[PDB]
Amino acid sequence: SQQTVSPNIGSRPRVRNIPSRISIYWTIVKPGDILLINSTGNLIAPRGYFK
Amino acid sequence: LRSLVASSGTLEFNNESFNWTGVTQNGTSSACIRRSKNSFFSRLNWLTHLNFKYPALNVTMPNNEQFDKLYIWGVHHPGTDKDQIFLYAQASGRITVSTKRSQQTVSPNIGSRPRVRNIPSRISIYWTIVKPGDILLINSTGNLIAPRGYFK
Numbered sequence: 001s002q003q004t005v006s007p008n009i010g011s012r013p014r015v016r017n018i019p020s021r022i023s024i025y026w027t028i029v030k031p032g033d034i035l036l037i038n039s040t041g042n043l044i045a046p047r048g049y050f051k
Numbered sequence: 052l053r054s055l056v057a058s059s060g061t062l063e064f065n066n067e068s069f070n071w072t073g074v075t076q077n078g079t080s081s082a083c084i085r086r087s088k089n090s091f092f093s094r095l096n097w098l099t100h101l102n103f104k105y106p107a108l109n110v111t112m113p114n115n116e117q118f119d120k121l122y123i124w125g126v127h128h129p130g131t132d133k134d135q136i137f138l139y140a141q142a143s144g145r146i147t148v149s150t151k152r153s154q155q156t157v158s159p160n161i162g163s164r165p166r167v168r169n170i171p172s173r174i175s176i177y178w179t180i181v182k183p184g185d186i187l188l189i190n191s192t193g194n195l196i197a198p199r200g201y202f203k
């Protein structure tokens with residue numbers, strides 16, 4: 001698989017006084033496979049994996 | 052959308068006043084003929100440039116009605132680049148309509164498509180539901196087919 005997401009700069013209705021947001025995404029990596037992250041900014045990187 | 056409207060069982064529309072300063076309202080087409088004169092969709096506003104300038108819009112519409120509001124808007128995909136300048140006076144800029152809960156970003160795609168009623172252009176229709184607490188936020192730098200109000 002491949003997931004490309006473009007950061008969208010723009011103010012949205014303030015939530016807990018924050019006009020910004022974080023869109024959450026998920027990826028499942030199969031026993032054979034390798035996780036590949038490419039970013040030039042705006043990424044909210046993982047700290048590890050879940051069972 | 053077809054079933055969302057059908058199940059609702061009403062076409063009851065309440066007009067709303069949006070701040071459209073810096074842009075020309077009520078854009079019309081020869082495709083849409085109403086009473087022998089050029090017109091457009093009755094429930095949609097075709098925003099054009101004002102004195103060759105399209106300011107980056109940031110129009111707000113809050114819900115204080117203790118009921119959900121259905122909003123219909125579009126994105127105009129001009130056939131030619133010349134049109135784009137004719138209508139909006141500048142290059143396309145991703146139309147973004149958001150709330151406290153959701154966000155919809157749509158990028159205008161300039162390109163000719165098979166002519167329909169001699170029109171190589173199109174309008175892609177989108178919808179947003181604003182909950183009683185929430186606020187409707189529209190950001191556009193051109194190509195937006197703005198609402199005229201909400202539906203019950």
Ligand SMILES: *[C@@H]1O[C@H](CO)[C@@H](O[C@@H]2O[C@H](CO)[C@@H](O[C@@H]3O[C@H](CO)[C@@H](O)[C@H](O)[C@@H]3O)[C@H](O)[C@H]2NC(C)=O)[C@H](O)[C@H]1NC(C)=O
Pocket residue numbers: 011013014019109110111
């Ligand atoms: C785009 O529209 C929104 C909504 O009209 C505005 O952005 C921000 O809107 C909030 C209210 O929704 C403003 O909040 C104000 O901030 C103070 C703290 O400084 C806070 O105590 C209050 O909640 C107060 O109402 C906020 O100022 C405003 N942001 C900016 C930069 O003006 C604004 O009209 C538009 N935003 C942009 C970036 O143009």
Ligand SMILES: *[C@@H]1O[C@H](CO)[C@@H](O[C@@H]2O[C@H](CO)[C@@H](O)[C@H](O)[C@H]2NC(C)=O)[C@H](O)[C@H]1NC(C)=O
Pocket residue numbers: 009010011107108109144145190191192
């Ligand atoms: C509305 O959204 C646009 C993006 O579609 C924002 O445009 C930015 O404008 C500033 C200059 O005013 C520049 O940083 C860029 O030209 C734009 N940024 C990007 C990422 O394209 C705009 O700020 C938004 N809101 C308002 C009120 O302008």
Ligand SMILES: *[C@@H]1O[C@H](CO)[C@@H](O)[C@H](O)[C@H]1NC(C)=O
Pocket residue numbers: 070072073
């Ligand atoms: C409408 O928007 C302009 C900015 O484009 C702002 O200066 C003006 O105060 C607004 N007018 C109303 C009536 O909200």
Ligand SMILES: *[C@@H]1O[C@H](CO)[C@@H](O)[C@H](O)[C@H]1NC(C)=O
Pocket residue numbers: 076077
């Ligand atoms: C657009 O036309 C409608 C009536 O068809 C009117 O309510 C609206 O104010 C017009 N826009 C301007 C800028 O006058």
